[PDB]
Amino acid sequence: YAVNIVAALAIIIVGLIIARMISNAVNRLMISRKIDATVADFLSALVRYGIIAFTLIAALGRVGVQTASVIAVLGAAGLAVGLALQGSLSNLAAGVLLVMFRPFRAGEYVDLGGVAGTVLSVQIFSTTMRTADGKIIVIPNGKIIAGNIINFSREPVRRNEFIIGVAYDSDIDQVKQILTNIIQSEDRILKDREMTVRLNELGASSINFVVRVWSNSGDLQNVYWDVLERIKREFDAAGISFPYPQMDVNFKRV
Amino acid sequence: YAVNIVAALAIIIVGLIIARMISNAVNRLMISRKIDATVADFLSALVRYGIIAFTLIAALGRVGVQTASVIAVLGAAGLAVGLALQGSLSNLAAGVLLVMFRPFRAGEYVDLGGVAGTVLSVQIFSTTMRTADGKIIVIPNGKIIAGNIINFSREPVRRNEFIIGVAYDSDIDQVKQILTNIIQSEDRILKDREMTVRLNELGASSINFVVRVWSNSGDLQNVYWDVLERIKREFDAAGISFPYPQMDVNFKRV
Amino acid sequence: YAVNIVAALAIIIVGLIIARMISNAVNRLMISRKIDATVADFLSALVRYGIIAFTLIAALGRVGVQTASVIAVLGAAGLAVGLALQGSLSNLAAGVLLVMFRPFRAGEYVDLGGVAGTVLSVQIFSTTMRTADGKIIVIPNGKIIAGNIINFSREPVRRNEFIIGVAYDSDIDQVKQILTNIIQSEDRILKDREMTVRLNELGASSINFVVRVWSNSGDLQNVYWDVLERIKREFDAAGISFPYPQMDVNFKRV
Amino acid sequence: YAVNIVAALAIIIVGLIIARMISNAVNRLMISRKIDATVADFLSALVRYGIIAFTLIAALGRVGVQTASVIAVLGAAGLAVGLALQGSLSNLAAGVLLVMFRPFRAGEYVDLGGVAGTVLSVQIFSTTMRTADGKIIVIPNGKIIAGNIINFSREPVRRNEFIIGVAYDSDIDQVKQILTNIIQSEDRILKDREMTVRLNELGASSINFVVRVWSNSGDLQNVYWDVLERIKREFDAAGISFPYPQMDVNFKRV
Amino acid sequence: YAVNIVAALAIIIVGLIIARMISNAVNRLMISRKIDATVADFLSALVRYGIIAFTLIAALGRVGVQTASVIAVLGAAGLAVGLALQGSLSNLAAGVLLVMFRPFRAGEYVDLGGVAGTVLSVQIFSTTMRTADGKIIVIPNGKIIAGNIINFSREPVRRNEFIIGVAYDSDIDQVKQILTNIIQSEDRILKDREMTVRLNELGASSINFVVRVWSNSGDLQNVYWDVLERIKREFDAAGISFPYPQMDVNFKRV
Amino acid sequence: YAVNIVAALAIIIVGLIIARMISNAVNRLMISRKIDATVADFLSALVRYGIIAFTLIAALGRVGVQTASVIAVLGAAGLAVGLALQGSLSNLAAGVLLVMFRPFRAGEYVDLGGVAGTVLSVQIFSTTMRTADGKIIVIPNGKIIAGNIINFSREPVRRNEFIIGVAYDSDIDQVKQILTNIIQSEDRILKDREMTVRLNELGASSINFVVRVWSNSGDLQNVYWDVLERIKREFDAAGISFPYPQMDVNFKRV
Amino acid sequence: YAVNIVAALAIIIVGLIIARMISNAVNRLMISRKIDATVADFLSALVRYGIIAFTLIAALGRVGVQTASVIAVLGAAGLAVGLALQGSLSNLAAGVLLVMFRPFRAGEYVDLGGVAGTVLSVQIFSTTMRTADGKIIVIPNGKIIAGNIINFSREPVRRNEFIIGVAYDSDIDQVKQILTNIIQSEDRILKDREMTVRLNELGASSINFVVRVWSNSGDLQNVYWDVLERIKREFDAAGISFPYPQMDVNFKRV
DSSP, X not given: OOHHHHHHHHHHHHHHHHHHHHHHHHHHHHHHHOOOXXXXXXXXXXXXXXXXXXXXXXXHHHHOOSSSHHHHHHHHHHHHHXXXXXXXXXXXXXXXXXXXXXXXXXXXXXXXXXXXXXXXXXXXXXXXXXXXXXXXXXXXXXXXXXXXXXXXXXXXEEEEEEEEEXXXXXXXXXXXXXXXXXXXXXXXXXXXXXXXXXXXXXXSSOEEEEEEEEEESTTHHHHHHHHHHHHHHHHHHTTOOOOOOEEEEEOOOO | OOHHHHHHHHHHHHHHHHHXXXXXXXXXXXXXXXXXXXXXXXXXXXXXXXXXXXXXXXXXXXXXXXXXXXXXXXXXXXXXXXXXXXXXXXXXXXXHHHHHTOSOOTTSEEEESSOEEEEEEEOSSBEEEXXXXXXXXXXXXXXXXXXXXXXXXXXXXXXXXXXXXEOTTSOHHHHHHHHHHHHHHOSSBOTTSOOEEEXXXXXXXXXXXXXXXXXXXXXXXXXXXHHHHHXXXXXXXXXXXXXXXXXXXXXXXX | OOHHHHHHHHHHHHHHHHHHHHHHXXXXXXXXXXXXXXXXXXXXXXXXXXXXXXXXXXXXXXXXXXXXXXXXXXXXXXXXXXXXXXXXXXXXXXXXXHXXXXXXXXXXXXXXXXXXXXEEEEOSXXXXXXXXXXXXXEOBHHHHTTSOEEESTTSSEEEEEEEEEEOTTSOHHXXXXXXXXXXXXXXSBOTTSOOEEEEEEEOSSOEEEEEEEEEESTTHHHHHHHHHHHHHHHHHHTTOOOOOOEEEEEEEOX | OOHHHHHHHXXXXXXXXXXXXHHHHHHHHHHXXXXXXXXXXHHHHHHHHHHHHXXXXXXXXXXXXXXXXXXXXXXXXXXXXXXXXXXXXXXXXXXXXXXXXXXXXXTSEEEESSOXXXXXXXXXXXEEEEETTSOEEEOBHHHHTTSOEEESTTSSEEEEEEEEEEOTTSOHHHHHHHHHHHHHHOSSBOTTXXXXXEEEEEOSSXXXXXXXXXXXXXXXXXXXXXXXXXXXXXXXXXXXXXXXXXXXXXXXXX | OOHHHHHHHHHHHHHHHHHHHHHHHHHHHHHHHOOOTTHHHHHHHHHHHHHHHHHHHHHHHHHOOSSSHHHHHHHHHHXXXXXXXXXXXXXXXXXXXXXXXXXXXXXXXXXXXXXXEEEEEEOSSBEXXXXXXXXXXXXXXXXXXXXXXXXXXXXXXXEEEEEEEXXXXXXXXXXXXXXXXXXXXXSSBOTTSXXXXXXXXXXXXXXXXXXXXXXXXXXXXXXXXXXXXXXXXXXXXXXXXXXXXXXXXXXXXX | OOHHHHHHHHHHHHHHHHHHHHHHHHHHHHHHHOOOTTHHHHHHHHHHHHHHHHHHHHHHHHHOOSSSHHHHHHHHHXXXXXXXXXXXXXXXXXXXXXXXXOSOOTTSEEEESSOEEEEEEEOSSBEEEEETTSOEEEOBHHHHTTSXXXXXXXXXXXXXXXXXXXXXXXXXXXXXXXXXXXXXXXXXXXXXXXXXXXXXXXXXXXXXXXEEEEEESTTHHHHHHHHHHHHHHHHHHTTOOOOOOEEEEEOOOO | OOHHHHHHHHHHHHHHHHHHHHHHHHHHHHHXXXXXXXXXXXXXXXXXXXXXXXXXXXXHHHXXXXXXXXXXXXXXXXXXXXXXXXXXXXXXXXXXXXXXXXXXXTTSEEEESSOEEEEEEEOSSBEEEEETTSOEEEOBHHHHTTSOEEESTTSSEEXXXXXEEEOTTSOHHHHHHHHHHHHHHOSSBOTTSOOEEEEEEEOSSOEEEEEEEEEESTTHHHHHHHHHHXXXXXXXXTTOOOOOOEEEEEOOOO
């Protein structure tokens, strides 16, 4: 009736003292194999939890009598292990596809669903990637093949999207002529591709022209800065005013 | 009692040294089959993890005695493999439906739930698609048949939705006449379909007319830019003022 | 010990060369059955992956010896296939209910949880629907019976919800009389149903009347535009001013 | 070795031609049973997919030899069917509880987690409900017993929550007296219940009184409109000003 | 070969006609047991779906021959039933814990993760709760023990959090003295507990004092209204001005 | 054929009448064991649902004949029970770790992923915690070890983060000197740790200094109030102005 | 018929009294093993719930007769235990990978998907991490390898991203010269890396220059404060004005 219960708890007691013994043993073979002062404690806790799990399945093998009282609960605690290693091993199967079917390698400035940065290394569970401002990010591989791996450095040619808000009173032909003269004077702009400068929308306080300019991927930010400084200089020189947010106030003196 | 445990750990030690041996062997047959310097290390780590899994199931086959002590935990670790390959192989089954039941092919400017761009290629796990500004995006196929695959280039005819905010004091008939004259003068607009220019809402600072204009899919952005530049020119010529955000300030001199 | 491993890897090598052979064979029977230049490569990759899976289960049938070493891992990789075809075949079972228990058919301007448009066709995995501006959207059927399928063209009669912001100094009886005269003069408004014009809330810069007007589903947008243009014309004629966003500025000259 | 594979593919070919034959047969018994021109094609595709599934399980019964090679993959593809009919049949089990344990019936203006409207009918997979502006919404029953089914017409008595922003310089006793006189003069307000008119918060541009008024569920919107029009009329008559958004501008002449 | 298929479909035909017969039979014993005109149709549809499921498992028992062709697919469709009754019966197991381990009973004004209201009754699948404005909400119990069940009426003593924005030029000692005099003059405030009136932050347009005042749970809103009306009256009497949103405008006459 | 069905339904009828009998019996032994008037009804409904489940499995044991017709559906309805007790018993396993591996005990003012308050008691399914304003919150333990359990009272020393916006025309050395004099004059500030007062950002209308001041956890809010009142007093005394939101208005008289 | 039911309930009664006995016994061996006054009650409740589960499975072993009536429901309640220990033990398997495959150790100021702080310790279920303002956060490890573990202190070199809004009338060469002189005069800036000072965008009220400056990770905030104070001082000295939010007001005197 209960003699199997009290015997099983006695086996759990000897399982705890042998958990202490094999934790010291795994620390000994850890310092025999490769020295690390803090992971030997967690390896000891892992083999301790495993051996009290083995003492647990021996315990309910002793107490349970009917036909499969140990077998069902053993496959049960194993299914707990299985759903536990769902996310921790799906990163492994994702890391298989990340290099065998590689959408990026170590060196392309990529963007892994949100954060962006050049990949330092694709490891077997993580992707250590230096972001644009030095913060090393590692990302679990089950999140990389969950979202869009938007690469940048795979295509050598990219496109700049300027938006230059000018005032309503400015002549459209003068602004389009000066903008096309600017994007024609710059030699880093690829002149074969789409160079569109036209009126994009009529916003609240201003109109604003889209200037879509293609360039190589390496000179992209340099073009985006140089053309914009050129736009500011030429628009200040040519009298085409940049507008502050306008407002039409109607007075009412009470 | 514990002699099966210490024998099982000895088998794990010979499993580690044979993991080293078969990692060198799989590197040798990798450079025999097809050369790649970095995936042979990860293939070696994969076969290493697999063979310590085989040593693990041999270990708990040695230690576990009862009826199915190896079988339940083996189906367990296999179910861990199964839930791990849930997301990594659902992309494969999605990539079956993506081409056998194809909603898009390589060349249509499409939008895969968020990001948008022409598809370069539909591979077996990803869809490499060049976005509109050169950033190559790959997307896992389990996300494509999770969201709306909103195509653009499947229908040859699309619709432009202008909104032109004009002032309250402007005559409605003059604005509607000039807008219909503009969308009638343009020949790229398909004159058979819906050409609606009517007062859409009365906003806070302005009224604004919706101009729904259909066109071919190739000339869509060119129509949206040319008609809008025409609207700005004709409204500046005809004296119909574009309004800045109005405000009715009531004074109070203390 | 390891002779089963090296024999199993040899079987994987002959599985790779017969994967090449049956990929050429499935390309041959594909061009025999129905010509498509790009799906025969992906069908070849599918039968290639299937036959290396069969070589894999033969491999661990050779290496595994105990009782069910092939059977547990075979049901495992099959359960990987099963969870992979969870989402890819739930669209099929949803597409059964979408037409057998049909909430919409090809032609009703519907809204499938977010995006909206007339359905071109309900296929067996997708619903190709032209949106209101020409973008063909296909939607996986497992998302349609996940969200609200808000139909519009099933009920022939719908309701317009005007909100007309007028100034605080305007007389309420004059605005209600002119609005009821407008919605009574229009004959496309169904005069039997709810025609409510009353003061809805007192906003910050204005008061605003709700004008709830029912109409047929086909004339709905035409009524919403014509009544609103009538409201603008009659309110400009009757002197009831439309207010810009007011503000009460208290001065303080330092 | 491979003779079972090529024989299995031959059986798949006769399964395809008998899929065509039984698709014509199910179309024939469909026009014998009940005529519908488009669902017979999808019923034909369903029985076609089912019979190639039966040919598939016969195929891997032929090729697989060991002990349970057909049985594990058959329970696998069945588990794919099971997880596919997870969401498609949970709506059925929800529709059981929706009427056996009914929180609403056809006629109460209810709100099913987001969208709101009177229920036209509670079907076995959906709840066709007319919203307040004519758009017929059907909602899958697995979403109704996922969220709060906030009923309105179950309780006959509801409460109006007015917020009337008045200026800071207004006398509090005059506003409270006029508001209580208004909510006492109206006879549709239930005088037994909570009639609270007190200063609720001191906002940025104004103070604002909460007027909590109970009424019957049928006269609720009529009370909310009539009392608010009464508030506007009496506050314009009594000189208690309604404030526009105030601002305290401190000058600085450079 | 196919004689089992055509015999199985014949059994499905007699299953459909006996589904009609037992639907009439369950309607007869429903009007024998307890009368309800609309749930007998859905009970008839439920027993109809169950008996075509039994005809289906008899059908694939006839067609499937090998070893467990009926057993695997029967446990499969049962697992479909099981995952279907996941959410529909987890509400039952939550409703066990909701009353055996009760965090609230019928009468405490509680807040069940979002919406808030006094509980009318805790049923076995739902919690009918009247919200503060009469809308009866029922909530599935699997959502209550998913989120925070933030009770209010379990603790008899609660705390009011006033924030009174006053101008920068006001003396801090005068405001703190008048506020402490107000919260000392009110007798419904519990004088033993935390009565903190101090400067909380320096906002953009004003400074604002936090007045944390404890009271009984029944008099909480009455204290929050009475103390605030007292604050408005005493601050208008004592000359401490309430500030409108300030702004420091620097002129520039072009 | 159907005699097992009608006999099974007869057994369901005697299961319903014995469900009534054992519901009265469990009410009798409930008032024998421990009196509670409302949970005996729900315990009666629970044992009623359990015994109609036993009558159901006896029913499909009678009707089902083949090999495991009762066994598969019994493990099925049990798996429904299992997924039902997923969330209702994961709180138990979380409550094990919450006290055996305790990150907080009854008395530390903690924050359990969102809401914050001192823990009154950690029960076996919930954590009754009084929030800072008296609202007793209970939280299911499966949500506590889902989110960050951000403790406050575990570390005795915390840090105040002042932000004091001053005008652009103010001298930086005077503000830094007065702020360091204030945070040096206060003795509750721990003078050993980080006392940083430097210019943090240049906002739109003002500059603003961060004043990071460490203190004990008990005196934290008292320091944050006293230092801020000291800042207001000393800045009003020293002529360093606090700025309202500035604006640079450029006139245009039409 | 029912004698097994009443005998099973009698066994549940002796299971309750032996639950009391073994709860006292586990309290006795708890004070024998290691003293803790409150976890012995919860350990007693855990062994109480376990032993009524054993009495429950003995009860339905007595009542259920057919073939596997105890076995299916026992694997069922065990699967309830398994899905309960899904989330509570996935933290363990995540904590294995967190230290064996370590992306951070105790001491690096890291950011675990949202909240950020230096890790005090990585325990076996949680990561106690002191945030930047003293609030000790523990985080379950199943959430760490769900999101991006964005480290900061792994890379020794990071980057500051200044944005300095200056007025439109300011000369671009003067601002770029003064900014480069400032970031060249500071010696803590790493002069080898990217020192970009160029015009970044033309905002509404101002233009604004990005100043991207790299530095060591320890001096990062000190550089960000010192360079910004230098920017304020040098821009006030050199006459380059900092702009308040501009506005272009057009008058209209009614």
